[PDB]
Design a protein around this nucleic acid. Sequence first.
RNA 1: CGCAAGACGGACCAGAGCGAAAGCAUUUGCCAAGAAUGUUUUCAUUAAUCAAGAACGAAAGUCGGAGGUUCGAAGACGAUCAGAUACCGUCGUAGUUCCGACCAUAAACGAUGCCGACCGGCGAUGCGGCGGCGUUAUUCCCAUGACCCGCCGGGCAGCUUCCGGGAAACCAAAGUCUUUGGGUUCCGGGGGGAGUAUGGUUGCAAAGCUGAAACUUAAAGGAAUUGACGGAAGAGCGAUUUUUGUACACACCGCCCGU
Lengths: 101, 51, 88, 82, 149
Amino acid sequence: TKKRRNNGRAKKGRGHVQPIRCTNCARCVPKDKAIKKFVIRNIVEAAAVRDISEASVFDAYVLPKLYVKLHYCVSCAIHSKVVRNRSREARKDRTPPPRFR
Amino acid sequence: NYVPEVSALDQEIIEVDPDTKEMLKLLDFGSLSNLQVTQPTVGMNFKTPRG
Amino acid sequence: EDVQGKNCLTNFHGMDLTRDKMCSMVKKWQTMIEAHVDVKTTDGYLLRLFCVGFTKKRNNQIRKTSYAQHQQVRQIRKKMMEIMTREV
Amino acid sequence: PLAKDLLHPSPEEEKRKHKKKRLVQSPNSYFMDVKCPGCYKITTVFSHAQTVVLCVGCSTVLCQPTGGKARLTEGCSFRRKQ
Amino acid sequence: GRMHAPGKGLSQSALPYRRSVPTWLKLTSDDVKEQIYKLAKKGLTPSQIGVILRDSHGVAQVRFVTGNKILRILKSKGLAPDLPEDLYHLIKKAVAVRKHLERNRKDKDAKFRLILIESRIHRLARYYKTKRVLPPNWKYESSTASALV
RNA sequence: CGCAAGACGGACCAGAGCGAAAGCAUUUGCCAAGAAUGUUUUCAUUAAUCAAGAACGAAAGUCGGAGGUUCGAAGACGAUCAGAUACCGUCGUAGUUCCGACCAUAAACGAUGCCGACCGGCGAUGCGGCGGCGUUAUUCCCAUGACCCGCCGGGCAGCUUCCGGGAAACCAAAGUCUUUGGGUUCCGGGGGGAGUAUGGUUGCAAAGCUGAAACUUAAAGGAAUUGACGGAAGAGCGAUUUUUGUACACACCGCCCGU
Ligand SMILES: [Mg+2]
Ligand SMILES: [Mg+2]
Ligand SMILES: [Mg+2]
Ligand SMILES: [Mg+2]
Ligand SMILES: [Mg+2]
Ligand SMILES: [Mg+2]
Ligand SMILES: [Mg+2]
Ligand SMILES: [Mg+2]
Ligand SMILES: [Mg+2]
Ligand SMILES: [Mg+2]
Ligand SMILES: [Mg+2]
Ligand SMILES: [Mg+2]
Ligand SMILES: [Mg+2]
Ligand SMILES: [Mg+2]
Ligand SMILES: [Mg+2]
Ligand SMILES: [Mg+2]
Ligand SMILES: [Mg+2]
Ligand SMILES: [Mg+2]
Ligand SMILES: [Mg+2]
Ligand SMILES: [Mg+2]
Ligand SMILES: [Mg+2]
Ligand SMILES: [Mg+2]
Ligand SMILES: [Mg+2]
Ligand SMILES: [Mg+2]
Ligand SMILES: [Mg+2]
Ligand SMILES: [Mg+2]
Ligand SMILES: [Zn+2]
């Protein structure tokens, strides 16, 4: 019984895809199958923003951002709840979740 | 059953595109005086930007 | 380079960009082209210069990606190298 | 769909199909008479030429081959035949 | 599809329905034959001769004008190569691949392509033996191939 | 702040491309090869699939040389545990890297042989060609690049459909099958014994290919449904009509493997 038409990966018209290492557990997982996440955040948190803006020597100094690319295997993605199981009909929907308010 | 005094369809001037005028002409209706030909939009950009 | 009685005198040694600038320049649906040259100045200083550029999406573009073909990338890289060579 | 006259396709239908998939095959190419401004000779050139055509009298490059069609040199005029 | 490739292309030529020479063409059969003879003496294969005639002299199809094909005209005149041009090109390509491969021992793709090319050469040689164009002792050997073409 | 060695080419990198398949990603140069598109060029049946026979063939493994950064089978320890000879942590030998000879095996998978014909829509995408308002760069001009709107031909795929199939899951092929015949190659015949013994053959070895019988058994197995469990979050042939997984249905107090 096939669960998915694409076999859970994004490989089409090619034979081999080089593996990467899970950020959490360092497992080898093919790059097309891995769960990718691009994280752009602030170096300083919300309270730290107000605590730092007063102690800075510059005027309206913009705090730098952190850019990180994260790769997860299926087990770590499910365990960390960045990915959840869906219904048989809801599996097909591949629209990203509505994070934009 | 509210009825206005005049019809909203009644217009002294109705604007049409040249293609609509040609379609009317093919049906021997190119003699209408209410028609006014408007310049079509120069740029053909009617699709949502894919992304 | 030299000390002159409580006055250290420095000289140019290099140039670079900040980490967040480079991280924010790289995006997912475009092409990146990089080049490097080794050029000697008239007074003996040998330099290695690196250049980076990205393809730009058009104002009225409907296609999601903006990819340059390989020959276009090679032409752009050669244009980078010759300009960087002729200015040093 | 379920009603189409295969014997009598419209003239625009047959110019939209592939040249081999028409009812009767017909090429998309043609021959043309070309004249350069320098020299008065008229040269017959195939539209999808694969060689550089030189004027016999005055050694002028009439056209340059490309992937699909041959592009005429600037200032050269052409007219289709028949 | 291709004999030795998975590709299934459809690109080719489509001759017109009419077989009559167009009115604008002023050339006679004899003039076309003389042009063909001059081009052959210059050292051109029939394919190149046809390409030149199509591009420059407005000769769409020589068989429509002169009533005969280029190779038959050459054979009647006697200016025809000993072995057919397509087999010559196949053997020349095999020689080029074999010359490349001797300096590059680790190029397995060259070996695969050489096997394919030699298979095509054997097919064509057997066909030409069947038609008696080649004597029934002609053999393609790698050592002899350089001298053959 | 420098030096040295070895291994790997991040982000860009995608249900994108190339290759017969294994497989393929820093720049530049050289060498040979190739698909697709264009063609009013040439030959004229030269073609398709294929016993015999051949080239290639991940990783691991074997034999000689060169290097040995990282990781790391075996091994020595420290923990955990009723017990661990495992999972976890510290080291660490072959190996992991390159050259030359072997080995020919993978869930080597689309679990789907190749060639040809016909049979619904839709929107994208990669390559080539053709046509056409209009924005930009090459200071001017064509023309060529970047966008925009279409058409054709191959290619990787996607959505939809009472085309029709099928036990169903699902499939525009897995359709055009009791209305059964387009060509052709390999290959299966209830579950075990068993891919085992023996013979032959190949290899340095490990092992590869070919390959039984005696005997034993009434089922094993596929798809789907309702429950029960979990140290998881009008429509269908028909049973039937919170999500999810199941080899459980005497329903986890289950079932079940090896000494
Ligand atoms: Mg594989
Ligand atoms: Mg995935
Ligand atoms: Mg074949
Ligand atoms: Mg072609
Ligand atoms: Mg392919
Ligand atoms: Mg890189
Ligand atoms: Mg065999
Ligand atoms: Mg190996
Ligand atoms: Mg090895
Ligand atoms: Mg060794
Ligand atoms: Mg350990
Ligand atoms: Mg270690
Ligand atoms: Mg096998
Ligand atoms: Mg697979
Ligand atoms: Mg199989
Ligand atoms: Mg397409
Ligand atoms: Mg392509
Ligand atoms: Mg295009
Ligand atoms: Mg049958
Ligand atoms: Mg049996
Ligand atoms: Mg039995
Ligand atoms: Mg009922
Ligand atoms: Mg019913
Ligand atoms: Mg499970
Ligand atoms: Mg399952
Ligand atoms: Mg159940
Ligand atoms: Zn993980």
